[PDB]
Coordinates of C-alpha atoms in Angstrom, one line a residue:
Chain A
X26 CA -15.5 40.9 38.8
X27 CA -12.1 40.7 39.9
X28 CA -13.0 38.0 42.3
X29 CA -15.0 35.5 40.1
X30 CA -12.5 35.8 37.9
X31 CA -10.3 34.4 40.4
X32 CA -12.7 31.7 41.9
X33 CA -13.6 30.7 38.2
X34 CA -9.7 30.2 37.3
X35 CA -9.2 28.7 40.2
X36 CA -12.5 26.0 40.1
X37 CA -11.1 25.2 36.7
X38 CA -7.6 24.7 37.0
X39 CA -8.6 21.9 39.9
X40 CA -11.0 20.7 37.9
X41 CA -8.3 20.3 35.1
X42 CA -5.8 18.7 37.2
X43 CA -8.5 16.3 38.9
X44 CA -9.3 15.0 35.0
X45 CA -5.3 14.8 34.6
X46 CA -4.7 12.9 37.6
X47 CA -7.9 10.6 36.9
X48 CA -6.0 10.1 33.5
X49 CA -2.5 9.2 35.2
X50 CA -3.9 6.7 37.0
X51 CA -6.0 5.3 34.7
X52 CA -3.6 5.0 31.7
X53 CA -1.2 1.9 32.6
X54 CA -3.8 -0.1 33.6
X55 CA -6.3 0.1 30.8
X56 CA -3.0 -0.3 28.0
X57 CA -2.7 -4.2 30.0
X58 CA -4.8 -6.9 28.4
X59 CA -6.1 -8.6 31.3
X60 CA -8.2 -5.0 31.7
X61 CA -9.2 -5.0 35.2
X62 CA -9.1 -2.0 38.4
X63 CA -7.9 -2.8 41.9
X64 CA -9.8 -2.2 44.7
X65 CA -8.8 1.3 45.5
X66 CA -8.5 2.9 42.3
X67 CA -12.1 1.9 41.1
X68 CA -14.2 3.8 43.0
X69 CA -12.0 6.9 44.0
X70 CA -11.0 7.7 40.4
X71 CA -14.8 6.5 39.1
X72 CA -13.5 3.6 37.0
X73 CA -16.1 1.2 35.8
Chain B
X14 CA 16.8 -20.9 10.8
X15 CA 13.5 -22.3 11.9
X16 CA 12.8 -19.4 14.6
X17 CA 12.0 -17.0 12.1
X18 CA 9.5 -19.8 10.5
X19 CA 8.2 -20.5 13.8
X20 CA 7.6 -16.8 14.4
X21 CA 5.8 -16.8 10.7
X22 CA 3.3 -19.6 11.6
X23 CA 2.6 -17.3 15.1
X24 CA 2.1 -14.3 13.0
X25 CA 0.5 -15.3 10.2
X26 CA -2.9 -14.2 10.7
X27 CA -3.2 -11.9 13.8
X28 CA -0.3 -9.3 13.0
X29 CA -1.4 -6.7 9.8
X30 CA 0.5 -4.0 8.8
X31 CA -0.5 -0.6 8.4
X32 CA -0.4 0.8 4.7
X33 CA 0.6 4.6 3.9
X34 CA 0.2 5.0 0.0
X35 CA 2.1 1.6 -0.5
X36 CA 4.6 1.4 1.9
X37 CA 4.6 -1.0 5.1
X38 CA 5.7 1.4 8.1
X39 CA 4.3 -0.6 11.1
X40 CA 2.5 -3.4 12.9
X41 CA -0.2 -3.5 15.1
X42 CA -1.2 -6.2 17.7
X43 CA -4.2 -8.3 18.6
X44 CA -3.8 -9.6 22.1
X45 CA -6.3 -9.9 25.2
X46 CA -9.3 -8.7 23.1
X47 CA -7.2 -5.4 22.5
X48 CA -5.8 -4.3 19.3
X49 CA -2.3 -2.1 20.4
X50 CA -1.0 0.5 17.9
X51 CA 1.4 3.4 18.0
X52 CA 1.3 7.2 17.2
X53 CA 4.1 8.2 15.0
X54 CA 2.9 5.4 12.5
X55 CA 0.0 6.8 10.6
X56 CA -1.8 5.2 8.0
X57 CA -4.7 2.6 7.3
X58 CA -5.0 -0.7 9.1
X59 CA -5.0 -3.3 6.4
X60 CA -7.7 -5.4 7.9
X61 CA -11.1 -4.2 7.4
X62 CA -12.9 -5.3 11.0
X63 CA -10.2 -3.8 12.6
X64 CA -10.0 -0.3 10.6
X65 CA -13.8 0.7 11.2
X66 CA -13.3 1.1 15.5
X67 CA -12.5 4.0 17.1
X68 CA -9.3 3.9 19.4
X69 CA -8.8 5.6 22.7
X70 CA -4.9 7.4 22.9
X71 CA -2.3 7.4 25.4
X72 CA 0.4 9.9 24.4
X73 CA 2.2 9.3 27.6
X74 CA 2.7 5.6 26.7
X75 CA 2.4 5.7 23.7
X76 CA -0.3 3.5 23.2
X77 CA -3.8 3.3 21.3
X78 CA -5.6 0.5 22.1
X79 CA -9.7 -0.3 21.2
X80 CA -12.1 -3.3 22.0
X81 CA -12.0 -6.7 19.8
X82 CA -15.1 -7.9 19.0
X83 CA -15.7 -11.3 20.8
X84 CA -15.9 -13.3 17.4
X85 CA -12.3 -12.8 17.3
X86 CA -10.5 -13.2 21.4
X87 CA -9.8 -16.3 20.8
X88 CA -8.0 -15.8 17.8
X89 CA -5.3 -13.3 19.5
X90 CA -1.8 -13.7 21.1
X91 CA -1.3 -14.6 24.5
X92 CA 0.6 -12.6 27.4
X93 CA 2.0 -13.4 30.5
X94 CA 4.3 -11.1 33.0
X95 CA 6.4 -14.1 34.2
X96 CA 9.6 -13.4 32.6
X97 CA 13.3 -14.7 33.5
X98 CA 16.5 -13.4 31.9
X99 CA 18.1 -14.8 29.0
X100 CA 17.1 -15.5 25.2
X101 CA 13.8 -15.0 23.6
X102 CA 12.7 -15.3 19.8
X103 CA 12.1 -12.0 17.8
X104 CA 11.2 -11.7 14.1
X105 CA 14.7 -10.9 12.9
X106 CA 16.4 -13.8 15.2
X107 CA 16.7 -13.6 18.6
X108 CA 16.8 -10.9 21.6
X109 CA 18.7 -10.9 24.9
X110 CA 16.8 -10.1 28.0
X111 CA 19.3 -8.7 30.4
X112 CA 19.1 -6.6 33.6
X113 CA 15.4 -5.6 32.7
X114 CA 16.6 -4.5 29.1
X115 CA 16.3 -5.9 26.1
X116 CA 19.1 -6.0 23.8
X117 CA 19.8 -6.8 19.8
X118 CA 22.7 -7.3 17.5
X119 CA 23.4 -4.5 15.2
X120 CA 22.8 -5.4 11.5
X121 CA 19.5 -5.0 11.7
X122 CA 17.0 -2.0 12.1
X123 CA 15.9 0.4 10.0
X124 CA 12.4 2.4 9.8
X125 CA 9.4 0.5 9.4
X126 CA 9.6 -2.6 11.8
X127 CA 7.7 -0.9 14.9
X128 CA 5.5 -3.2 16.7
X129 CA 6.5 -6.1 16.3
X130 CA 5.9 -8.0 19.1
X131 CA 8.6 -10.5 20.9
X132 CA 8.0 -14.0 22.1
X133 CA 9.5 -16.6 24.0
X134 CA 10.2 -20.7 23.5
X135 CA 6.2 -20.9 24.4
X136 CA 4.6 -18.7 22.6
X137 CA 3.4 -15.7 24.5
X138 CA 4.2 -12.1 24.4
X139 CA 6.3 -10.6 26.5
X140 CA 7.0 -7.0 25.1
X141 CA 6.0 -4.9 22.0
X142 CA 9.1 -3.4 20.2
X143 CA 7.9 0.1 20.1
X144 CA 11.6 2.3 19.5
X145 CA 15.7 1.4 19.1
X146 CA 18.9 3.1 20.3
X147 CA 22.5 2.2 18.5
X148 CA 24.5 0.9 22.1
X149 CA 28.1 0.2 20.7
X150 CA 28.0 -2.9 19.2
X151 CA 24.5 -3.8 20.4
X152 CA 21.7 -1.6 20.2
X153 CA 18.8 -1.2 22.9
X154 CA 15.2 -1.5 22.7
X155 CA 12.3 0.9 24.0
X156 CA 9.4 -0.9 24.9
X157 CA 6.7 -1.6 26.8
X158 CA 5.9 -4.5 29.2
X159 CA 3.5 -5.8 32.0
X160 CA 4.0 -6.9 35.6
X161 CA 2.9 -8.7 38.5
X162 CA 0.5 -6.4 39.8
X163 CA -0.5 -5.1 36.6
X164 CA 0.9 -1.6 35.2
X165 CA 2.1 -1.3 32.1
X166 CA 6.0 -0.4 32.1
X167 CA 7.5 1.7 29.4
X168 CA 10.9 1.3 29.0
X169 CA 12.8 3.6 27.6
X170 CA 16.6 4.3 27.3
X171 CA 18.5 7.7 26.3
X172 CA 18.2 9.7 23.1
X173 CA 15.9 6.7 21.2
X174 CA 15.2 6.7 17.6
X175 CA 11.7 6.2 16.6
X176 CA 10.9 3.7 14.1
Chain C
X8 CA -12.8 -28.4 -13.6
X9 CA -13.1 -27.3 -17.2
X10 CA -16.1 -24.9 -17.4
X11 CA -13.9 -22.1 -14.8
X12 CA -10.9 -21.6 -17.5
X13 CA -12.7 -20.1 -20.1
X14 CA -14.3 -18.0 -17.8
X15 CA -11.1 -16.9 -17.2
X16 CA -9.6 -16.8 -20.8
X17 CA -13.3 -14.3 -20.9
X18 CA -12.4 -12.2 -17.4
X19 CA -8.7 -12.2 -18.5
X20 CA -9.3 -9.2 -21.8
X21 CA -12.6 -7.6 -20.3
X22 CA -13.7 -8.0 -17.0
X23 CA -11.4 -5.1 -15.2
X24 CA -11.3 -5.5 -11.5
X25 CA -11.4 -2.2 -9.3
X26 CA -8.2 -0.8 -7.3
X27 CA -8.6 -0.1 -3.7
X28 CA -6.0 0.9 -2.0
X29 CA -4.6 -2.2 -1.5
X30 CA -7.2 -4.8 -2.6
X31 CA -10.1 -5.7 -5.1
X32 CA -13.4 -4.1 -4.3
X33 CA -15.3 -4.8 -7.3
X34 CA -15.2 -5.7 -11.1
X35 CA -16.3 -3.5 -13.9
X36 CA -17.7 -5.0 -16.8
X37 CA -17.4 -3.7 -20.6
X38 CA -20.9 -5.4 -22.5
X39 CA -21.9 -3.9 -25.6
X40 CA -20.5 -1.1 -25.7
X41 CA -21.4 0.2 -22.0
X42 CA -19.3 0.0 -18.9
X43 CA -20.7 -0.9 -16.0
X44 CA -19.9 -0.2 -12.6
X45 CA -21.8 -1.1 -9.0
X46 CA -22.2 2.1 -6.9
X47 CA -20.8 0.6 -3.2
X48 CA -17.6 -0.2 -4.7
X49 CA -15.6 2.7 -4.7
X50 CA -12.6 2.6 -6.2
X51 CA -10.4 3.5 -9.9
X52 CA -10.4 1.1 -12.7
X53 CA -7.3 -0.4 -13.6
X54 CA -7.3 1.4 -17.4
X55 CA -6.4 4.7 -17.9
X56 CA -8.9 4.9 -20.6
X57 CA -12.2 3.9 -18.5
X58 CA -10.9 5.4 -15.7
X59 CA -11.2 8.8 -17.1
X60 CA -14.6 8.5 -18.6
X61 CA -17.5 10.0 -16.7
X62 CA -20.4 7.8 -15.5
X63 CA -24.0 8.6 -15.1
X64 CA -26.0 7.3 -12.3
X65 CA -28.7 4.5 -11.4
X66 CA -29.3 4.4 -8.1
X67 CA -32.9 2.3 -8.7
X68 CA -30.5 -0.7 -10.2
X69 CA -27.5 -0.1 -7.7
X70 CA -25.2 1.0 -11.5
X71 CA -22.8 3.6 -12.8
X72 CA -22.7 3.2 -16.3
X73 CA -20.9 5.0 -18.9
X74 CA -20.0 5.2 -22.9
X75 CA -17.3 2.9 -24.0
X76 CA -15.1 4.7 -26.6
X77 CA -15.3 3.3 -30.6
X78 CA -12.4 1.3 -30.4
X79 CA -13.2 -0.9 -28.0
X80 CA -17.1 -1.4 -28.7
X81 CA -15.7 -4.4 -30.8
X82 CA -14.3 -6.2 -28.0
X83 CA -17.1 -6.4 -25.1
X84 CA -19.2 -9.1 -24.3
X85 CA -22.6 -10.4 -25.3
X86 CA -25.4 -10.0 -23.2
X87 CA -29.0 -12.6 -24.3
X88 CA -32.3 -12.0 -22.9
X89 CA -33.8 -15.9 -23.3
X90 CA -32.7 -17.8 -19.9
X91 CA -33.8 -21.3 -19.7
X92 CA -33.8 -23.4 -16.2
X93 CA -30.8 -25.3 -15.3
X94 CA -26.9 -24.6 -14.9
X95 CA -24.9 -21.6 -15.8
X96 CA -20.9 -20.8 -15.3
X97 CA -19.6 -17.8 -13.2
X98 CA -16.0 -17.4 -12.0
X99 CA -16.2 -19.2 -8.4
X100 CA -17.6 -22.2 -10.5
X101 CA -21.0 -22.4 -11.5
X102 CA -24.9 -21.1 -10.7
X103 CA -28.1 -22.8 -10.4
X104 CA -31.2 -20.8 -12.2
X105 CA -34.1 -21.6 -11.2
X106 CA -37.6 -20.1 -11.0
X107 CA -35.9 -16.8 -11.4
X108 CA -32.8 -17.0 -9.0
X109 CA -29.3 -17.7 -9.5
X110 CA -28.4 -19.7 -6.4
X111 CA -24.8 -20.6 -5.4
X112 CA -23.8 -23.6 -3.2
X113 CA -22.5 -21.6 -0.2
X114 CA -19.2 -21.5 1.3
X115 CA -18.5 -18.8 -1.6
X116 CA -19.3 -15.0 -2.1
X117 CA -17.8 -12.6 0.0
X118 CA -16.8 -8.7 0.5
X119 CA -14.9 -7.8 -3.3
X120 CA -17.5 -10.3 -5.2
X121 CA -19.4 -7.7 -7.0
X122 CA -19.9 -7.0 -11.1
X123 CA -18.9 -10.2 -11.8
X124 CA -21.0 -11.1 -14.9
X125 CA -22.4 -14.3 -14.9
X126 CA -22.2 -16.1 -18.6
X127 CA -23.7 -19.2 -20.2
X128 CA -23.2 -22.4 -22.1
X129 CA -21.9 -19.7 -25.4
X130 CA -20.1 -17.4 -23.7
X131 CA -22.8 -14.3 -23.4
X132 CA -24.0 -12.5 -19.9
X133 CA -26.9 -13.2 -18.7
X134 CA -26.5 -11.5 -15.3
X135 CA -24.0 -9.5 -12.8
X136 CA -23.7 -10.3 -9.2
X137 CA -24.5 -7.4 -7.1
X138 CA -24.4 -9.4 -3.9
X139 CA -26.5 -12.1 -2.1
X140 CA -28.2 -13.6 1.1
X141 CA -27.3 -17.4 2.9
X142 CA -31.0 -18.9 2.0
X143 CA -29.8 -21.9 4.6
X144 CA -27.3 -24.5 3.2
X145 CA -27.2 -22.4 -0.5
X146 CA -27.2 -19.0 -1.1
X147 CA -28.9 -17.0 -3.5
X148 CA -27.5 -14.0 -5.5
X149 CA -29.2 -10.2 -6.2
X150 CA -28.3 -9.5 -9.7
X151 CA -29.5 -7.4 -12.6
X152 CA -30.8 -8.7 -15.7
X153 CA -31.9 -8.1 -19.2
X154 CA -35.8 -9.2 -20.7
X155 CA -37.0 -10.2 -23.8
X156 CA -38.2 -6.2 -24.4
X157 CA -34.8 -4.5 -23.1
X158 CA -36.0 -3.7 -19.7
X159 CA -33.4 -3.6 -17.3
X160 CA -34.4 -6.0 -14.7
X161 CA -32.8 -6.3 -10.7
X162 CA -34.0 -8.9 -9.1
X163 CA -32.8 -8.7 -5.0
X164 CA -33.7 -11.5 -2.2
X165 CA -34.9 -10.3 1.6
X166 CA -32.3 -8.8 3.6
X167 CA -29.0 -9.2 1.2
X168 CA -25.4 -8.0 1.6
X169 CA -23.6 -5.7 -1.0
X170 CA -20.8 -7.5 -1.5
Chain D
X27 CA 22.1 -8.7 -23.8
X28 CA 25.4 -7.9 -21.7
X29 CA 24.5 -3.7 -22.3
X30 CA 21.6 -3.9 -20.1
X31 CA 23.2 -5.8 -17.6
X32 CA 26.3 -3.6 -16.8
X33 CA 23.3 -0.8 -17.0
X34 CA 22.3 -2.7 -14.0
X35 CA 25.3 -3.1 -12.4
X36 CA 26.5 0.8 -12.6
X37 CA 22.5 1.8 -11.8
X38 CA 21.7 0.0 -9.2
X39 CA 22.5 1.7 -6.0
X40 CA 22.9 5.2 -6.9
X41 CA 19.5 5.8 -8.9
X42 CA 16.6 5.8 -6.5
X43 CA 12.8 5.6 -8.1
X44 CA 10.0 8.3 -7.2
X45 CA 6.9 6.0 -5.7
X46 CA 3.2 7.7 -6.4
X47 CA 0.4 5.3 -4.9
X48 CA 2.7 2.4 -5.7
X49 CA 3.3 3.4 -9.6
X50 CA 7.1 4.0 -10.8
X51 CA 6.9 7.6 -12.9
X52 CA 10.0 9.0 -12.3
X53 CA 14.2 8.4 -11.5
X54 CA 16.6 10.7 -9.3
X55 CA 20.1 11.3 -10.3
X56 CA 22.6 11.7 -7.6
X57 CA 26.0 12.8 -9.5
X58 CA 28.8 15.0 -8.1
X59 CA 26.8 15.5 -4.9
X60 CA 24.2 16.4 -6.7
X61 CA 20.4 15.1 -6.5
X62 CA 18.8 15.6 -10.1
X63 CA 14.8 15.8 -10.3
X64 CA 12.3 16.7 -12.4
X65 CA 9.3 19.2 -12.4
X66 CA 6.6 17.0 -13.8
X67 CA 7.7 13.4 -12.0
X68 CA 5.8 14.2 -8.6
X69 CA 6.0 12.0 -6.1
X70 CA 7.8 10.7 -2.3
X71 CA 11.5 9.4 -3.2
X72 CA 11.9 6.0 -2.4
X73 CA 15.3 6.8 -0.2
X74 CA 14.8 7.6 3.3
X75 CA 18.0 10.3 3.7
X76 CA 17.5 11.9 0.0
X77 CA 13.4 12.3 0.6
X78 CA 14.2 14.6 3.7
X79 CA 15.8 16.9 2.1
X80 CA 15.1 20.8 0.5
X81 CA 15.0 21.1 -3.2
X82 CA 16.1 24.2 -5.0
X83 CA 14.2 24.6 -8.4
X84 CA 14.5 25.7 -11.9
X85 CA 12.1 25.6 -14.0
X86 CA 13.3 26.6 -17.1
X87 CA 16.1 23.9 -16.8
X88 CA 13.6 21.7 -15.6
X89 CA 15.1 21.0 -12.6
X90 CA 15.4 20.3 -9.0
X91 CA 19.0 20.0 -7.5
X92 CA 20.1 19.6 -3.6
X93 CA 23.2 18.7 -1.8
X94 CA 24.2 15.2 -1.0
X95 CA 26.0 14.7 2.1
X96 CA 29.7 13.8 2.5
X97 CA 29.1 10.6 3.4
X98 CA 27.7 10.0 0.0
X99 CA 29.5 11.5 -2.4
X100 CA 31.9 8.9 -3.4
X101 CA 29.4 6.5 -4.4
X102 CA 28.0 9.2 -7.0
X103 CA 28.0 9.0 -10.7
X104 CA 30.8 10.5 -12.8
X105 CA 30.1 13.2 -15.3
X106 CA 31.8 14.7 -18.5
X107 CA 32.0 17.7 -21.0
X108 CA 34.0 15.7 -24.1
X109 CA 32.1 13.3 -26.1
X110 CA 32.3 12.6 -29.2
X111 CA 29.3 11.3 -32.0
X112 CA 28.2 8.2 -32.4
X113 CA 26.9 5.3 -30.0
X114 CA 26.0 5.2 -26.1
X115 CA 24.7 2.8 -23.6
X116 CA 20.7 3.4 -22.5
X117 CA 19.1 1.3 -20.4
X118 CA 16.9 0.0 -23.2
X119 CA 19.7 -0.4 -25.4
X120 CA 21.9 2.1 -27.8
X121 CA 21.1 5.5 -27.8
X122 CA 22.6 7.8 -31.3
X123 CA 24.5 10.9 -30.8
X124 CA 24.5 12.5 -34.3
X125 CA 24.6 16.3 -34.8
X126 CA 24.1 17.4 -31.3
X127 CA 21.0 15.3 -31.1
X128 CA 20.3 12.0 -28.7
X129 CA 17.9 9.9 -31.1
X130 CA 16.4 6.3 -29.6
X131 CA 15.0 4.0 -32.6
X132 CA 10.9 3.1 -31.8
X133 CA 9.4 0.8 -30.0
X134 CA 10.5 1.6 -26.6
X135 CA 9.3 5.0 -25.0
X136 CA 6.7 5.4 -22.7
X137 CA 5.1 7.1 -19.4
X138 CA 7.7 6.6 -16.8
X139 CA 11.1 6.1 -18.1
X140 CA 12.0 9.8 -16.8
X141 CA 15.1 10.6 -15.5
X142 CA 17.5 8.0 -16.9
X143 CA 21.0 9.1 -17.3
X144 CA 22.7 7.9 -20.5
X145 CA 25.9 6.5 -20.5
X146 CA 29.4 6.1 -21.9
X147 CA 31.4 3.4 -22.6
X148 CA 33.7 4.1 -19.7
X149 CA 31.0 4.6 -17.3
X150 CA 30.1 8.7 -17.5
X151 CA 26.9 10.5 -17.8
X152 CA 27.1 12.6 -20.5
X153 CA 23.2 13.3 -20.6
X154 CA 19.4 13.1 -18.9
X155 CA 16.7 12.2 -20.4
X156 CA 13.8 14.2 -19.9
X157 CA 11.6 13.7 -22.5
X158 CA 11.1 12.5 -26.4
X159 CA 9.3 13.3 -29.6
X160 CA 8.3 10.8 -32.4
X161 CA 10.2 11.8 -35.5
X162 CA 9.1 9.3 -38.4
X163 CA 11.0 5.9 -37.6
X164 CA 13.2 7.1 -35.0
X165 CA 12.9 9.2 -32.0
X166 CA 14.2 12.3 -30.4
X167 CA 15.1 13.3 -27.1
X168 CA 14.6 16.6 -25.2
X169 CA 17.4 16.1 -22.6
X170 CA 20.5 18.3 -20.7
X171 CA 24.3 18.5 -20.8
X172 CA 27.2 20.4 -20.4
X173 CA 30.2 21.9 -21.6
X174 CA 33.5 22.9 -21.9
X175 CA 32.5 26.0 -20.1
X176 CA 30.6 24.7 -18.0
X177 CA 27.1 25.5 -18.8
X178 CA 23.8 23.4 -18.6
X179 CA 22.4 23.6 -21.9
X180 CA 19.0 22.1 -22.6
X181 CA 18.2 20.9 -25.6
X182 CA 14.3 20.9 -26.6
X183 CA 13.3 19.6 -30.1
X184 CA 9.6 20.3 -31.2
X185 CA 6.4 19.7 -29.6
X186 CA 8.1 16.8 -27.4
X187 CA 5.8 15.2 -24.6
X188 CA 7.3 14.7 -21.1
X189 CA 7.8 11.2 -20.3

């Protein structure tokens, strides 16, 4: 019990983190009105 | 004089302000196929197109932003990130542009003029007047801007009063 | 021209347009003794004596209609069941009739065009404009009317727009 | 003629109306660094500093009171216990003083006027007005004052309707 407590709080708070860096990285260039993703950024972070 | 009628004709049609029981407590923006408006003004958008869209948030900048339908890009403001220092034309006159910070006379500023955006002697948006801080004799302005590579800067000086 | 000003001299004592919140939605009319309202415009009437009276419902013929109190049952308009063919006045100039359908040369009828009662060469209503459809280079309206037996009659084109 | 215009003059910074969807039902006080307010009059006060504030009530008085800053207090009203009977400035007109009673001649009097301070010759407020009653050709009004003693008597003729 103790344990998948443990591994589920843990799995969760990367996964949290992983969404709020996808957000950091995302947000300045989605506010810009030319609305286009470099190279890099695209495909490591998912953006489409 | 004729700046403040020049930046009436630019703003004639694309800026609409945002209602709250009667009273006029901000502006939004229609530029790039994007319609930018900020949090701590809440109310209804006065235009009806533009009131029926959902808007994605950025708390962090301070944005919300949506998608104009393409009946309407070409009918919005332009933008550009080349930008010396100097003078440029705001609705209340003009605005210095000095060390990266943009700068008005006091006089003016109260509650209720937040986004308003500021042009230059062509007629393209450079920044988005977003909040104001009382400098002395002349206040500061915190905003947010574009640049070369394409991140949007905010800008924002100490202990800012939102408007 | 000349035919629009006594439409208005008319629309001026008894034609009450609707208050959204910051704009016109819609136009109640008060005809003989029965206040009518459309359904899609949502909104308070300008007086504070029909705004407080309850309505009851049509949804068949797109109405709210309600009881005009005693004191103003003097001062509504006249409403005539015989229509001939030809040319009848409304308040963005006039209306063609004709087999059945009040057509409007287009360019005219939008969003807040609605319960606008279309009168005649005496002065009496003959119809109210619910809304309408671009038939091409003329557009034709979807209003209610009155027979020779007092039937309620809506007449409504393919595909229109409430207005 | 000249009445109404030094009305204007001594009014027209210092009283502040309520706003409620756009429509004017109600004026603040601010005398001797104090902000008058009524029960009934509900709405936003059109003064940014004075609107983000905290009320204390009375409502047997009829009420609301607060405490202007120091920074405002010289541009207040005056007030006074001595008056004698006879004539005052209102902001429609003359206003009677006879036997402990403020009486308005018809014709004026409506939903909104609420809150009006009535004024001296010198430039005092010797009484708010509240509300009135119709009393045959002329009217009568349910207001508060003071005293010698320093006491805020309310004075309530019968069945009066708040304005």
């Amino acid at each position: 019990s103790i344990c998948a407590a443990i591994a589920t709080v843990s799995v969760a708070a990367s996964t949290w983190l992983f969404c709020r860096s996808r957000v950091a990285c995302l947000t300045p260039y989605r506010l810009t009105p030319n609305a286009r993703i470099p190279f890099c950024l695209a495909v490591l972070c998912c953006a489409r | 004089g004729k700046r403040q009628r020049m930046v009436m004709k630019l703003e004639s049609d694309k800026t609409f302000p945002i209602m709250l029981e009667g009273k006029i407590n901000g502006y939004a923006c229609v530029v790039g196929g994007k319609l930018f408006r900020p949090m701590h003004v809440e109310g209804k958008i006065d235009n009806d197109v533009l009131a029926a869209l959902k808007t994605k948030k950025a708390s962090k900048y301070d944005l919300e932003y949506a998608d104009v339908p393409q009946n309407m890009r070409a009918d919005t403001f332009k933008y550009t990130h080349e930008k010396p220092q100097g003078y440029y034309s705001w609705h209340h006159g003009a605005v210095q542009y000095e060390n990266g910070r943009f700068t008005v006379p006091k006089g003016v500023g109260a509650k209720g003029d937040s986004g308003r955006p500021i042009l230059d002697n062509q007629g393209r948006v450079v920044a988005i007047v977003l909040g104001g801080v009382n400098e002395g004799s002349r206040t500061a302005l915190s905003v947010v801007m574009w640049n070369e590579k394409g991140v949007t800067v905010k800008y924002t000086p100490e202990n800012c009063e939102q408007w």
